Each structure stands twice: as C-alpha cells, then as structure tokens.
Structure 1
Amino acid sequence: TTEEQAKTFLEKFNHEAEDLSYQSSLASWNYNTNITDENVQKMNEARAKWSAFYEEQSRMAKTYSLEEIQNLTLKRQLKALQHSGTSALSAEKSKRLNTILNKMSTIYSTGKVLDPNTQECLALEPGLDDIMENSRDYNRRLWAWEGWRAEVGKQLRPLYEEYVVLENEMARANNYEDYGDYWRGDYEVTGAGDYDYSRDQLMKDVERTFAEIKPLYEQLHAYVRAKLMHTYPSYISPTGCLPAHLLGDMWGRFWTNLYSLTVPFEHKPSIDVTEKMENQSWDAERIFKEAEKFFVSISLPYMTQGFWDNSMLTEPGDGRKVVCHPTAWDLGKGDFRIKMCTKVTMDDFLTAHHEMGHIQYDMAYAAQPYLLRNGANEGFHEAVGEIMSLSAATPHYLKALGLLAPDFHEDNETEINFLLKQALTIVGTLPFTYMLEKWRWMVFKGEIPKQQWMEKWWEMKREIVGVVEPLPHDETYCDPACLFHVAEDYSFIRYYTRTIYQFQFHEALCKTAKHEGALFKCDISNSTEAGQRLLQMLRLGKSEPWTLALENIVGIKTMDVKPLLNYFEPLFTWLKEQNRNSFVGWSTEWTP
C-alpha cells in the first residue's frame, strides 16, 4: 500500500543523501580550517547542491499521507521530510523575511557606540564586552549598558515588529497556533502511549521546575546583593532588586564575572593544575590522550586513527587562518574530527573532555538513518558534554593523573568556593533563560500587544529575576533584541532543559558507580556499569521518543530538578547560615 511505497522512497533517500551530506560537510571543514576565497566558493557550491537535493526530496515526500503509515520509524522520517517551514509562505513574503533577518544580523554585528571622551567607536566585541566584564566604575558601566541599548535596539524595534508578523504567518501556514508553538514542537511526542508529551506540557513542566528552583536562587541573590553593597555603597537598596548594569556582562545572562567580588574565602586559592602541566611538559596531544583514556576506562570505544591524523588539535603556524571556536564534527561515513586551538591549561583540559564526549555521542548512533542521527531532543547533546567536564574537574580524578600531590588535603572552604563559583554560572542563568523565553512565547502568542512590549519586559525582570533597570525605557526601545539569540532567531529554552538534564544524568550515573558521599565529589572513572548505562541511551539517537531515552538512563520519564538541588545542598546550607542577618527576597517598587 502506501507504506511499501514510502519504504521504497526512504530507502532511495537514505542511499542518495550520504554522499551529498558528506561532501557539504567536508567543504565546510576545509573552509573553517583554511580560510581562502576558493574554499568559500567550494563550500557554497556544496551547500547549494545539498539544498537542491533536499528541496526536491521534500517535495516528493509531501505526497505520502502520514495517517496511513503504521511503522513509527518511517513515520518520523516522513514527518521530518514533510516540513515546509518558510517555503509555506509566498515568494514575496519569504524574500521579505530573509531580508529582515539579514538586516537584523548585520545591525547586531556592526553596531557601534561613540565614546564622547576619547572620540573612539566601540563595538560590542571586544569594546563594550571588556567594560561590562571587568569595570567596577558605576558610571562607565551605565554608559556602556545604556549606549548599547539606545544605539542598536532602537534600530531593531521596527524590524522585529515585522519579523513577528511574518513568523506567525509562517507558523500558521504549517498548522501551528503560533511561532512559539512551532518552536515547542521540538519536545512533542505522539502515538507512543504513556510516553506521549504535548507542547503545552513543556510550559507546565518549565513552570513547575522553576517554582522549585526559586528558594536556592533567592539565597544566592541575597548573598550577591550583600557582597555588592560593599563595592557600590549608596547605589544598592538592601531590600530591592539589583541594578541591571552591575551583573558582570552586557545582559546579566551569567553571574560568573562577579566571582572576584563574591568569593566566600579569598585567602584560600582554587585548584589549578596548569603550573603542574607546564612543569611536566604536557602538550595538546597528551591532553586528548588523557581524555581518550578516561572514556576507555568506562568501557567506551577508542578514537579512530582518522581522528588522530585529520583533527586540528593545535593552532597551525604555517600561515593558515582558522576559527578557534572548539567544535566536534561528524562528517559522515566514519569521519569524526575535532577543531580546537588547544593551550596547556586546565580549562583546555576540561574542554577536551567535553568535546570528546560530543564525539562519543556522535559515534554511538552512527547506525541510525540519516534523519534520526541526533540527540533525543535539543538538550541531550550538551548535557552529555557537560557531565564529562563535571567528572574531570574533581580532585580524585586529578590525583589519579598525578596532577595533584598524593597527600593533597581537601578543606571545606575550598569546596564552598568551588560550589559558589559553580552556582554563579549554573543557578544564576536559569531565571534569565526562563524569563526571556516566557516573554517571547507571550509575544508570539499575542498576550502582549506591541504597545506594552517594554512595559512587560521590565515588570517580569523585576518579579522573576530580581533585576531593575537603571533608566526607564519606553516603546521606542527593544531590549530583548539586543541579545544575540533573539536577533538571530534562535530558540532559548534549550539552555534551561539541558541544565535540568545534566544533573539528572550525573546523579543517575554516580549511583550506578556506587559513589559514597556528596554528589559534587563524584567521579565515574573506572566504572564500566555506568558506561554501559550511558551507552544504552546514547545508541538510540532520535529513533525513540525522548521520554523513553530519559527513562532508559535515569529510570523516570519526566524532568526533575531535585538532583540539581542535591548537587548544591552544602552551598544551600552555608548560604542560609550566611544570610541570617540579611533580608531574603526583593521588592518590585524600589528603583535606582
């Protein structure tokens, strides 16, 4: 019937897609490690060929009816192939949407603010970022924070208004309620019984987990406010929100750069093995050999010989221009590579472990059909990458490698410093991510008319994040669009769920490893049972619903935030003891 013809069609598609995808990936790799005009031309040609093939195959796939297909693997492949996207719009509307997207990207990339004192124009990178990351001058930070939003966001406001309308039209053309519902379609599971998951369930689950996250974040917020009152007397209310321009970066997405102002025990130095690595004459190859040994110790496979002779592990010195962003590449047909400009530092050590975890995930699901070769959903890959870095940083793993002395002493003040630094990065970014995505969902849905976009932006900031703007902004501003992911049309909730997944995976493996003690001291090295448990989920790829894969690794099919609170419990106790003579919480009435 229809299923047999669809099976024939999918066999043909799978046979023909391999070579084209591989050639496009190889051209992209050759451009990225060797920047020349001819390489750009070759990369563009390969991408054009792949795009033409994929468009023709999607057009052919749309003729088959999903309701007639019984097998779920074929149904998933056909549903992936039958999505039109912007092609559901008319040609004029699609051209207008592309023009708007390119204009917003260019405005973000080339925006500049003119410093009155020195007659110098600063771009966001590196000019304004250096001020927000390192300045302790209230006025200089205020100048940068206000100038970026006045110079760039006011240009993006009308473009973003047009972009919202066009994307809603696109989403309704593909049988979605709106563009946010379209984005939330990533987590949707249908026709699987107890494993089904709707698009509204995602919003319900996010709200439920954030309500549980709130008390720890309030303790952290009070501690940070009390610390910052020493650096900025007369600028910070003891019972109010934090001013938005004193949070360590341009948006307050991370609180990391505040560590030097908030370290609980300044006299105790952190663990850093860089000097020990320099004393023993390490190089990048040895770092990656150690990462490979770590993965072998938990019964994962070795790297391939092609991985060793085709990767770019150090920055070349032969006159080639490269990009030094660490990436893991799955080109296809057994070709796995890593691009990284490795230095001899502890951070590069952790990054090597993280990227080799990406490679291991890519290798596990290599037998799946092409359209199903990815993580279970958009948050799985990065969580898998993060747990390896969690294991690699513990003193146990470093003492086993000889990077610490055998008689190394672990005092609890060093541990509290480490936990506070982890919290500044992990706990502090969750309310930001949640608030941003909630605002975008309400804008796409239409619950916020454009006459109140900014009004609802700062009302939510004060009430969910405890952050207050230093200057009031009317509807000529577009503050959310001054962030990269908003201006480049990227969904943001992946950064939330990934966090929830991370500590769910870690705690599940540490129990399989029979770890005794606190969760933040867990190292899963030399535990083959934990490796097998991880491989059970990794081999699935995207051929099963993500709830089934989650139940495979952790034993339940739902997102839970209790493992995260279990990771930070000693810090939670210390914080509640430190804030005993401080106000916990904020008011939404005080303003700078």
Structure 2
Amino acid sequence: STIEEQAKTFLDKFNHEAEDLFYQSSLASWNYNTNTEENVQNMNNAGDKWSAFLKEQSTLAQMYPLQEIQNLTVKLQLQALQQNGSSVLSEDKSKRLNTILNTMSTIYSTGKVCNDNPQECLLLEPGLNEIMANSLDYNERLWAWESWRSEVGKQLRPLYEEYVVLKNEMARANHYEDYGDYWRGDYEVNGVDGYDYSRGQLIEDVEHTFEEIKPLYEHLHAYVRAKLMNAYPSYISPIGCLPAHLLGDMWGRFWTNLYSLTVPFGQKPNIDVTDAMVDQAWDAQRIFKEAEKFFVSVGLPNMTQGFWENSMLTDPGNQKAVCHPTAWDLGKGDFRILMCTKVTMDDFLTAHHEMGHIQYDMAYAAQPFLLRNGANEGFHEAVGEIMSLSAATPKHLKSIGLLSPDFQEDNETEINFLLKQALTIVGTLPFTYMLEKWRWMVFKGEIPKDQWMKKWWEMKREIVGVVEPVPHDETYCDPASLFHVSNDYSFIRYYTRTLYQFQFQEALCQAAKHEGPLHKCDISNSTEAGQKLFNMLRLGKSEPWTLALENVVGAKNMNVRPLLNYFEPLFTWLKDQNKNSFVGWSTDWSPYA
C-alpha cells in the first residue's frame, strides 16, 4: 500500500490517541491552578506520560520515509512527529539537561532577595516588580535591580554554562549548527514552490529589518533620557546610555511602565478608562462578555458555553493559582482562560489579547492535531496583540460607551496615547533583538565563558543604549535573570510578533476600509476584515507561515514599514524635540566613574 496511504492511517490512529492523552496532560495542568486538595501533583505525572507517548511515536514515524510522501499535509505531520529531539542524547546527558532545566526554572520561580532582615524577603512577584514599577529612589531601584541579578543571577551561571553545552550537543546531533540555529528552525520552510525561508535568512531579515527601525528608536530614546534627567537629576548623562534600573521594570523589557514621567502632554484628560469602569459597576464577567461581543461583530463565533462554565477569570484568593493571563487550548473542543481579572482598562485590553488567542485556537482546531498552532512562533502572540490595538482606540472606547463622545480628540491626545504605545512597543524591540543576538552568539560558541557578561553589556550599551548601574564580573549571569532565558524560550518571537502584528493591522484595516492614521483603526463591526483574518487563523501551521502572511498581507516575508507608518506622527514629532537634544549615545559613559 502507498506508504503515503499507510502513513495516512498511521496518523489517523496517532491523532486519536494523542488528542486523548494531550487532553489528559492539559486537564491536569489546568487542575494544578484551578482546584481543593488532590490536584497539586498529578500534573507532573500525566505530563511525563504524554512525554513517554510522544517519544514512542517518533521512534515509529522514522519508519515512514518522507521522500515517498505526496500529500503535503501528511508530509508536514510526519516531518513534525519524526524528530529525534532531546532523546538523541546519552541517557545521563538527557537526564542531566532535565535536572538543569528544572533547577533553573525553580531558582527563578523561587528566588528571593532579603535584607539584617534575613527573614524579610520580597520575591519577583509583587515584591520587586511592584518597586521597579513605582519607586523613584535611584538607590532603592538600584538595590532591587542589583540584588535580583546577584542572588538569582550568580546561581544561574554555572548551570547556564552547562546548559549551552548539552543544549548544543542536542542540536549538533540533530544536524543543526548550534542550539541557536535550532531555534531559528521554527521559521524555516523547505520544498514549497517559491515560499521557502532559510534558517539563517531570519538573522538577516531581522538585522536588515533592524537598521530600518533604528532611527525611530534613537529619537524615542534620546527623548526619554531628557525627561528622565528631570525625574532623576544628577544621575543621567545626555551623551550616554540609560541606567537599566530606571527603565520601569527589572530588565527594562518594556518602558510602558515608567511613563507618567515621560508623558508629553500631561495637561490632557487621561485616556485611562480604568475608573470609568468602576463607576459603571463592571465585573470581570462584563469585560470578557464585551470582548466576546467584540469578536462576534467581526464574523467570528461567540465562546463555547463551557468555556464560560469552567474557565477561571476572577481569582479565588481563598485556593491560590498562577495569575499570569493565559489562554488554554486543551483537547476535545475545550477552551478556557485563566486570568485574575481586576476592573481595569489594562485588564480589559488583556481580555481582548487572551481571547484573541482562544479565537486562533478555535479557528484551527479542525486541522489535524499536530498542526494546531500559530503558523510560526509569535504568529499567535501577534494575533492577540492586534486585538488590543483595535480595542484600545478612542473610536472603540467612544462607541463601547466607556468614554463619552464629548471627548476632544486633538493632535495632543494623539501623541499622549501614541507615545505610551511606543514605550511598550518600540520600547521592547531593541531590547529583544540584543537578548537573542546574545544567545545566538553564545550558542554559536563566539563569546567564551570569560567574557559573557562583558560582551553582554557591551551589546546593551551598543545596540540598546543602556548601561549597567554597577560593574558585573563573570560570576554574574544577567540574561538568565529574565524568564524566557532561564525557562528556555526563544525570545526573538517577541520581535517578529511585533512586525507581523502591524502588517496585519495594516491589511486588516485596509479591509475595514479605514481612512486616517493607522492607529485610530478599530476593525469591530467589520466582518470584511474578520474573514480575511480567519482565512489565515483556521489554517494553523498547515501551510508555511510565509504563505499564511500573504493571505492576510501580500508579502511572503515580514515587513518593517507597516509598524513605522503606524508611528509616523510620533516619529516626526520626536525629531521636533530632538532638534536640540543629543540624539544617540556613547558606549563609553558609565554611572560609576
């Protein structure tokens, strides 16, 4: 029988068993956060069983030679399934890497900085993040910054060195260049007519998409430093980089946060509807319902009843669970969101962002199990963020009745809002590029163990325009203090995410027949767009992501300009202020002589 046809029914019976078991691992994880007594520790078992299963099925899809696979769909699944993966390691080395990943995950998860008060400690959650978010005492923020990067940082170092060894050895064995080359693999595609993407063509299309995004960044950067000096006098030099612990969070991943300082026209009525909501007695339920309602209008389905009936969106606090807003596609037509909602404009937009995830999930749940996923990493993240935009516009707030049409919408509130967005968005782009430009260089074996930190900050000052507030020797391991580093995630996705994110909103508002600046757009009511969108959503990881884009946009590859053109009004305004300010920075300055 055609080995294609023989693999067809092999995959049929695989999908069946896999959907059953993956519903088991997912239901047990939900139950970890969701519910009583007897739920704390079954998650970890049923996950290893999933792991056992997946391992067997790879050892058995090796028997299906891809070359003889005509059906493009079965090829992909087969390809996906048959990856030797981590198992391709000396038994002990496979365990030792495991041992390492758990240790690193836990140290970060359970790391705390203390005070002659060795009992009193704050953690990363509330503790420090709440300080890096509000506090305006340079020395205090520096203490938070440094204490974290020291206590949970130096711990991570020796482990992280070992982690790159085996982690490479796993890639080098899987005929990838290095573990870095391995992660880029996600954006790869082979053997599809003029739709291909090279594993290393990502680096170039990032680097070459970066030179283009560099001008906008510098003017935003040189603008903030000026307003920062005014909040922290004495501390900030206008030739040199910004001192990390002043960027509004532990790492300076976003600048969203410390904004009240860098606000342009603080004279204006504030576009935080956060309290407008409270005044209308809005509960966590009225948010999501108004978000479901958003989607309905764009040609998509109302949430599955049952999503409603066992989705946790309020916080029990009486039970304790992980409040990091998540959207869950367990098997078996089962979708739900876990989110500890507060009556906020922020938690309101997060609702749209998470439910966007659910909508992507529901869209493609018909695709064979193995291909139920974002076209590539950070497709998913983008499809959630594209919703915030439409749902965080005055046009939206106005109509939704959370802000009265009385609202004067002059060019002043324009920047007011468009700035906050850039703090969050243009903020993170260069942070992100460097973080991975670093790991890429490490995983390649370019930076040695004795320069890791020196080459890190060299790059922080160089690319990102940020200086360490204290010298760090090589006992430190600062990138490791960030989640996605110690919990072993590709981070470059957050970058690609943002680029697509706009390409979408561009073509999607094009469909909604929008008129002015791209940021005023609000695709709701517009079924015309929702279908353009769904047409790619439902596809899952079924066609290559290059094509999946072309469905929504027109290009086989990411593009930078949609983003830039969204920020055009802010860009030509920041030059206005940086007419006299010093624009750019020197690697050479440091707050410590």
Assess same fold via TM > 0.5. yes
Residue 193 of structure 1 aligns to a residue whose secondary structure is: coil
For residues 17-416 of structure 1, the aligned pairs below 5 Å read 17-34=18-35, 36=37, 38-116=38-116, 120-316=120-316, 319-416=318-415
Give, in angstroms, the shift of residue 118 of structure 1.
Answer: 8.9
Give, in angstroms, the shift of residue 419 of structure 1.
Answer: 1.0
Give, in angstroms, the shift of residue 391 of structure 1.
Answer: 0.8
CA deviation digits over 1:407-452, x for unaligned, max 9? Answer: 3221222221111111111001111110010110011111222222
CA deviation digits over 1:132-155, x for unaligned, max 9? Answer: 222222222223322322333223
CA contact (8 A) 1:115 1:122 kept: no
- Relative to structure 1, is the Cα distance of residues 110 and 569 closer, same or farther in structure 2, using a 3 angstrom cutoff? same
Judge which range, 537-546 or 452-461, deviates more: 452-461
Q: Which amino acid aligns with 1:95?
A: K
Residue 328 of structure 1 aligns to a residue whose secondary structure is: strand
Residue 57 of structure 2 aligns to a residue whose secondary structure is: helix
CA contact (8 A) 1:270 1:418 kept: no
Measured on the aligned residues, the alpha-carbon RMSD in Å equals 1.9
Residue 113 of structure 1 aligns to a residue whose secondary structure is: strand
TM-score (norm 2): 0.95
Tell me whether 1:584 sits opposite 2:583 in the alignment: yes
Runs of 4+ in 1 over 6 A off after TM superposition: none
- Relative to structure 1, is the Cα distance of residues 572 and 42 closer, same or farther in structure 2, using a 3 angstrom cutoff? same
Partner of 2:457: 458
CA contact (8 A) 1:512 1:529 kept: yes
CA deviation digits over 1:461-487, x for unaligned, max 9? Answer: 111011122222222222222222211
- Relative to structure 1, is the Cα distance of residues 90 and 507 closer, same or farther in structure 2, using a 3 angstrom cutoff? same
For residues 399-548 of structure 1, the aligned pairs below 5 Å read 399-548=398-547
Give, in angstroms, the shift of residue 162 of structure 1.
Answer: 1.3
Give, in angstroms, the shift of residue 62 of structure 1.
Answer: 1.6
CA contact (8 A) 1:314 1:342 kept: yes
What is the distance in 1 between the residues matched to 2:174 and 2:21?
A: 27
Give, in angstroms, the shift of residue 381 of structure 1.
Answer: 1.0
Give, in angstroms, the shift of residue 521 of structure 1.
Answer: 0.6
CA contact (8 A) 2:353 2:385 kept: yes
What is the distance in 2 between the residues matched to 1:302 and 1:144?
A: 44
Aligned positions, number: 590
CA deviation digits over 1:20-67, x for unaligned, max 9? Answer: 22233223223321053x223443443343333222222111222222
Judge which range, 553-562 or 13-22, deviates more: 13-22
Give, in angstroms, the shift of residue 285 of structure 1.
Answer: 2.8
Partner of 2:12: 11
What is the distance in 1 between the residues matched to 2:279 and 2:237?
A: 48
- Relative to structure 1, is the Cα distance of residues 204 and 22 closer, same or farther in structure 2, using a 3 angstrom cutoff? same
What is the distance in 1 between the residues matched to 2:119 and 2:19?
A: 54
What is the distance in 2 between the residues matched to 1:322 and 1:102?
A: 20
Partner of 1:568: 567
What is the distance in 2 between the residues matched to 1:327 and 1:502?
A: 19
CA contact (8 A) 1:168 1:178 kept: yes
Q: Which amino acid aligns with 1:190?
A: N
What is the distance in 2 between the residues matched to 1:91 and 1:166?
A: 12
What is the distance in 1 between the residues matched to 2:169 and 2:69?
A: 29
CA contact (8 A) 2:397 2:403 kept: yes
- Relative to structure 1, is the Cα distance of residues 165 and 237 closer, same or farther in structure 2, using a 3 angstrom cutoff? same
Residue 337 of structure 1 aligns to a residue whose secondary structure is: strand
CA deviation digits over 1:558-586, x for unaligned, max 9? Answer: 11110111111111111111111211111
- Relative to structure 1, is the Cα distance of residues 140 and 321 closer, same or farther in structure 2, using a 3 angstrom cutoff? closer
- Relative to structure 1, is the Cα distance of residues 322 and 472 closer, same or farther in structure 2, using a 3 angstrom cutoff? closer
What is the distance in 1 between the residues matched to 2:554 and 2:434?
A: 30
What is the distance in 2 between the residues matched to 1:63 and 1:341?
A: 46
CA deviation digits over 1:479-524, x for unaligned, max 9? Answer: 2222222112111111100000111100111111111111111111
Residue 245 of structure 2 aligns to a residue whose secondary structure is: coil
Give, in angstroms, the shift of residue 237 of structure 1.
Answer: 1.7
CA contact (8 A) 2:251 2:482 kept: yes
Give, in angstroms, the shift of residue 117 of structure 1.
Answer: 7.8
Residue 314 of structure 1 aligns to a residue whose secondary structure is: coil
What is the distance in 1 between the residues matched to 2:549 and 2:54?
A: 31
Give, in angstroms, the shift of residue 128 of structure 1.
Answer: 2.9
What is the distance in 2 between the residues matched to 1:395 and 1:218?
A: 28
What is the distance in 2 between the residues matched to 1:35 and 1:429?
A: 39
Task: Looking at secondary structure, tell me which structure has more helix per residue.
Answer: 1
Unaligned stretches of 5+ in structure 1? none
What is the distance in 2 between the residues matched to 1:311 and 1:112?
A: 31
Partner of 1:551: 550
- Relative to structure 1, is the Cα distance of residues 218 and 52 closer, same or farther in structure 2, using a 3 angstrom cutoff? same
- Relative to structure 1, is the Cα distance of residues 2 and 469 closer, same or farther in structure 2, using a 3 angstrom cutoff? same
- Relative to structure 1, is the Cα distance of residues 425 and 526 closer, same or farther in structure 2, using a 3 angstrom cutoff? same
Give, in angstroms, the shift of residue 359 of structure 1.
Answer: 1.4
